[PDB]
Amino acid sequence: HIDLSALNPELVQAVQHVVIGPSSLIVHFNEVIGRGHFGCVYHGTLLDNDGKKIHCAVKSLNRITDIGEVSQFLTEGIIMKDFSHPNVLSLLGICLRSEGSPLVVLPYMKHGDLRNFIRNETHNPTVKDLIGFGLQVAKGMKYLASKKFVHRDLAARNCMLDEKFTVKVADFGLARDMYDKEYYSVAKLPVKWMALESLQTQKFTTKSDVWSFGVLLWELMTRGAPPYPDVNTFDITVYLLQGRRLLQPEYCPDPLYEVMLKCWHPKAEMRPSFSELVSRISAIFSTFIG
Ligand SMILES: O=C(Nc1ccc(F)cc1)C1(C(=O)Nc2ccc(Oc3ccnc4cc(OCCN5CCOCC5)ncc34)c(F)c2)CC1
Numbered sequence: 001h002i003d004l005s006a007l008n009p010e011l012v013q014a015v016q017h018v019v020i021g022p023s024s025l026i027v028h029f030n031e032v033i034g035r036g037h038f039g040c041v042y043h044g045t046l047l048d049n050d051g052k053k054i055h056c057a058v059k060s061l062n063r064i065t066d067i068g069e070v071s072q073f074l075t076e077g078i079i080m081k082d083f084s085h086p087n088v089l090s091l092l093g094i095c096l097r098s099e100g101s102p103l104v105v106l107p108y109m110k111h112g113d114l115r116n117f118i119r120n121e122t123h124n125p126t127v128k129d130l131i132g133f134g135l136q137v138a139k140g141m142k143y144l145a146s147k148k149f150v151h152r153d154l155a156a157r158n159c160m161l162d163e164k165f166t167v168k169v170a171d172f173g174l175a176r177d178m179y180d181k182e183y184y185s186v187a188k189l190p191v192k193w194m195a196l197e198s199l200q201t202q203k204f205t206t207k208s209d210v211w212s213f214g215v216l217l218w219e220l221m222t223r224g225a226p227p228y229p230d231v232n233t234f235d236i237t238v239y240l241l242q243g244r245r246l247l248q249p250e251y252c253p254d255p256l257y258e259v260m261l262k263c264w265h266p267k268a269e270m271r272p273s274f275s276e277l278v279s280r281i282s283a284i285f286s287t288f289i290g
Contacts, residue, residue, distance in 0.1 A: 001064070001098070001100070002064050002070055002101075002102065007071055007074070008071065011071065011074055011075060011078065014078045014081070015074055015077070015078065015094050015102075017081075018077070018078075018091060018093045019093060019094060019096060020094065020095040020103075020105055021095075022095055022096075022097050022098070024046060024047045024048075025046055025047075025103065025105065026044060026045040027044050027058050027060075027103065028044060034175065034178035034179065035178055036174070036175050036176070036177035036178035037062070037177050038061065038062060038063075038069065038174040039059060039060060039061055039073070039174045039175040039178075040059075040175070041059050041175055042057070042060065043055070043056075043057065043058070043108070044058035044105065046105060054092070054107075056092055056105050056106060056107060057107075057109070058103050058104070058106075059103065059105075059106065059175060060100075060101040060103055061073050061101040061174070062101075064100065064101050070102070073101075073104070073174055074094065076104070076173045077094050077104045082147075083143075083144070085139075085140060085143040085144075087136045087137065087139045087140030087143070087166065087167055087168060087169055088140045088143060088169045088170075089106060089107070089169065089170035090106075091105070092105040093105050107162070109160040109161060109162050109168065110161070110162055110163040111162065111163070112161065113156070113157050113158070113159060113160055114133060114156040114159040114160065114161050114167060114220075115155070115156035115159075115219060115224045116224075117161050118130065118133075118219070118220060118223045119224035127221075127251050127288065128285065128288035128289075128290055129165075130220045130221060131220070131253075131281065131284060131285045131288070133161075133220055134216070134217050134256075134281055135278065135282060135285050136166065136167035137154075137169060137213065137216060138213065138274055138277045138278045138281055139278055140167070140169035141154070141209060141213060141277075142273075142275050142277070144169065145209070145274045145275075148206075150205060150206055150208075150209060151171065151209045152171075152204045152209070153171055153176070153193070153212075154169070154193065154212040154213055155193050155212065155216060155219070156216055156219040156224065157180050157183075158170055158171050158172060158176075182233070183226075183233075185233040187202070189202065190212075191234075191236050192215070192227045192228050192231075192233070192236055193212045193215045193227075194208065194211070194212070194236075195207070195210075195211035195212070196211075196240055196266060197268055198211075199236065199237045199240075200237070205268060206274070207268035207271050208268065209274075210263050210271040210274065211264055211268075211271065213263055213274070213277065214260045214261075215227055215246070217259070217260050218246045218260060221249035221252040221256070222249045225249075228246070245260075245261060245264055246260070253284060255280075255284050256281070256284055259277065259280055259281065259284070263277075
């Protein structure tokens with residue numbers, strides 16, 4: 001029972017342009033994908049004009065009493081609405097209901113998030129497969145960078161993986177907390193994925209997304225190891241400034257580690273673009289038979 005009239009009117013039209021009628025969406029409330037402090041995610045079924053059922057994920061707020069939270073939640077969906085790329089998560093629409101939270105509707109991702117997938121010892125991606133996942137993230141980021149979109153929380157935990165093992169760059173946003181508390185430290189910042197200059201200024205750019213991408217590559221090559229496990233979250237700046245980087249994973253090819261070190265260049269301006277990363281990683285990927 002939100003009052004649409006209290007919201008920013010630009011925001012509300014934007015939402016109406018991607019609206020899903022409540023009768024077209026069935027939320028399976030008994031089938032919870034995750035719960036957090038601010039939000040939760042359910043399995044859902046979306047019907048289109050022909051009655052074709054689409055399996056989706058349905059994101060909700062836990063409270064609708066704060067106009068800032070509601071506005072922020074809707075704004076997260078609107079930020080997404082024009083992302084149209086095979087390696088970026090898309091928005092199915094937003095469902096405004098007479099009572100309760102508005103609902104953000106996402107295509108269902110069979111294999112959940114990338115970090116949990118590569119940590120699952122019941123799948124066995126090859127080194128080539130893992131580099132391929134990295135290449136897909138780079139392609140999604142090349143697309144987002146071309147739109148001048150800065151991600152700010154690129155990490156394996158925020159990338160999704162569908163039934164075809166296509167990686168979709170995403171951001172759990174208000175539902176980041178469902179899992180993954182410890183990696184965010186006081187606004188809660190993902191400090192072990194952050195560029196040196198962001199640690200110092202809390203400002204983010206495409207070049208700091210590149211630093212994060214370097215850490216994501218390290219996550220891939222270690223099959224989801226936590227970075228800097230021995231370092232207190234509040235001390236990562238001191239640690240890096242001693243002259244340190246993440247070590248080369250055992251099965252990380254030398255040229256890929258060189259790419260990681262480029263992503264962590266002390267000068268943001270000198271880090272490779274995502275266009276360059278796509279080119280470089282495409283070449284490294286191609287040297288593997290399987
Ligand atoms: O992603 C977002 N924005 C965004 C930002 C930057 C960008 F580049 C792209 C999108 C926003 C967002 O809310 N994203 C989001 C991403 C994943 C979300 O969670 C899921 C979506 C689709 N399928 C899912 C599937 C899933 O698990 C599937 C079942 N698992 C599978 C693995 O093993 C156990 C069972 N878990 C969460 C899913 C979600 F509810 C919201 C803030 C809007």
